[PDB]
Amino acid sequence: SVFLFPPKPKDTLMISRTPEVTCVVVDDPEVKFNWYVDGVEVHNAKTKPREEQYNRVVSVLTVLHQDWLNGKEYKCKVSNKALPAPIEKTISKAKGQPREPQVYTLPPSREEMTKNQVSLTCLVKGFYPSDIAVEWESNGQPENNYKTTPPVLDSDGSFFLYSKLTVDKSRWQQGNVFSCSVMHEALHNHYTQKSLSL
Amino acid sequence: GGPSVFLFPPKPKDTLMISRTPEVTCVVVDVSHEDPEVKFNWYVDGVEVHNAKTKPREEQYNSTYRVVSVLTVLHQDWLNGKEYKCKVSNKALPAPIEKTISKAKGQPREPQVYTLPPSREEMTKNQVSLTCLVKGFYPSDIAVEWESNGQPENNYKTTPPVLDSDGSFFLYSKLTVDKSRWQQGNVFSCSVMHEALHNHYTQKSLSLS
């Protein structure tokens, strides 16, 4: 079977990064690939050499930023003697008017203050499509100890998520500034940032 | 590729309340017309059991048969980690197919439940977000609900559980209310049910100070 995968949200949002869609064929024979952008074939995909199994022969096309964002379809045609027919699979960005995320940072609960570590919460809601990236920072230094929930469909058809940054209570108590940064196509410069401290 | 088998656990609320009836459900799909009779065997920890209730087979529009067997589980067997095996046997099958399901393995851990008021920034809107952070729980089976004044608040969404760095789980539930209701001092509470809680239940309240 074939499996087609979109680029990483962050990759499509920053010119410096390289967005790519990825065809992952699975399950002794040889393979072929044809890539089409809105029908038109293009000839600049690169195959990751026929790697091993358990018991995948993966190709990778890079894409233009504004193409993906403008909704172009990316078709992956896979030829094989052993497969009944030449399988195809398409992917594209979710359709619909983009909506700007609203970002709110929330400090730890009074009641959490007893613990060794505390939870800094960044709420991000009202956004569409669900392609987004969230990061935390202090003094322009990345934090590592954070988790972000998947996007969840809200009643109005927009998405929300929460990000949770965990810190030693002393740092919070000291009064250091922590920033939730969010990247999304509907933000100005695809990026915003909200700060939190005591 | 013949018929396929899927095995579903009970609902987390069902295993936690004596009043409710937890079940495991074994679903067989893509059963042909040539060989439409299917047999179910059920085992709890390898020991066969005989009280499952199998629905009579339903034809689909694609000419497959879909048939389901329902085994009620005792609440304490599920919470005690018993394994439930469904064996599906069918004439058009290289061998019977077996699926096994149980509560996730590990030591249970009590949720910490913290309620969080709207950001100042959000107050400029017609509606605001009441947050329930629930963290530190294992396994991930949990139920979350919001109420105010004895009644269910219906406008809420809860994230799936997320695996935290310590191997415990967390989630957030977001309750959206009209701002007026928040400013008017109403008290809202976030109810959470999980095996590692006393009486499998706790409630935390939120109101404007």
Ligand SMILES: *[C@@H]1O[C@H](CO)[C@@H](O[C@@H]2O[C@H](CO)[C@@H](O[C@@H]3O[C@H](CO[C@@H]4O[C@H](CO)[C@@H](O)[C@H](O)[C@@H]4O[C@@H]4O[C@H](CO)[C@@H](O[C@@H]5O[C@H](CO)[C@H](O)[C@H](O)[C@H]5O)[C@H](O)[C@H]4NC(C)=O)[C@@H](O)[C@H](O[C@H]4O[C@H](CO)[C@@H](O)[C@H](O)[C@@H]4O[C@@H]4O[C@H](CO)[C@@H](O)[C@H](O)[C@H]4NC(C)=O)[C@@H]3O)[C@H](O)[C@H]2NC(C)=O)[C@H](O)[C@H]1NC(C)=O
């Ligand atoms: C022998 O062994 C083989 C190898 O094990 C085995 O192959 C296996 O086949 C599986 C199917 O049997 C197959 O499973 C699929 O999984 C998909 C999820 O994606 C994966 O997630 C796994 C972990 O979570 C990983 O194991 C996979 O690698 C993959 O993870 C992603 O990998 C991408 C590949 O590059 C990454 O993208 C790129 O990342 C790079 C960075 O490195 C760049 O950033 C780049 O820009 C990116 O493009 C990506 O990072 C990574 N992501 C994550 C999160 O880890 C599923 O999508 C798929 O499910 C869908 O189909 C099934 C039916 O097959 C269906 O049940 C399911 O519901 C899904 O249906 C789809 O649903 C959505 C709507 O919700 C719609 O799109 C459609 O309606 C519907 N589509 C279809 C087609 O039905 C599926 O489960 C797996 O790929 C493979 N195992 C591994 C380990 O690779 C082979 O089968 C064996 N053979 C035999 C005979 O046994």
Ligand SMILES: *[C@@H]1O[C@H](CO)[C@@H](O[C@@H]2O[C@H](CO)[C@@H](O[C@@H]3O[C@H](CO[C@@H]4O[C@H](CO)[C@@H](O)[C@H](O)[C@@H]4O[C@@H]4O[C@H](CO)[C@@H](O[C@@H]5O[C@H](CO)[C@H](O)[C@H](O)[C@H]5O)[C@H](O)[C@H]4NC(C)=O)[C@@H](O)[C@H](O[C@H]4O[C@H](CO)[C@@H](O)[C@H](O)[C@@H]4O[C@@H]4O[C@H](CO)[C@@H](O)[C@H](O)[C@H]4NC(C)=O)[C@@H]3O)[C@H](O)[C@H]2NC(C)=O)[C@H](O)[C@H]1NC(C)=O
């Ligand atoms: C002909 O037409 C048929 C119908 O039109 C069609 O049948 C369909 O076949 C599909 C596969 O071909 C089959 O797909 C699977 O669906 C599973 C999800 O379960 C369903 O979810 C759907 C939406 O989410 C619902 O629509 C379904 O009803 C069902 O949902 C659940 O049903 C349960 C049983 O009733 C409910 O639980 C019980 O609820 C009651 C209350 O009513 C009680 O509370 C009781 O206690 C409960 O037990 C449950 O509530 C309900 N949920 C919802 C939301 O409604 C998927 O599980 C499955 O995906 C998994 O397998 C695939 C690979 O096969 C894999 O890609 C995917 O990732 C999943 O992998 C699993 O992952 C876990 C870990 O994460 C592993 O542990 C597992 O090992 C791994 N599984 C495997 C096998 O490796 C898959 O998508 C579909 O359900 C079926 N539908 C019907 C109606 O039959 C048929 O195919 C057609 N034939 C053709 C075209 O030829």
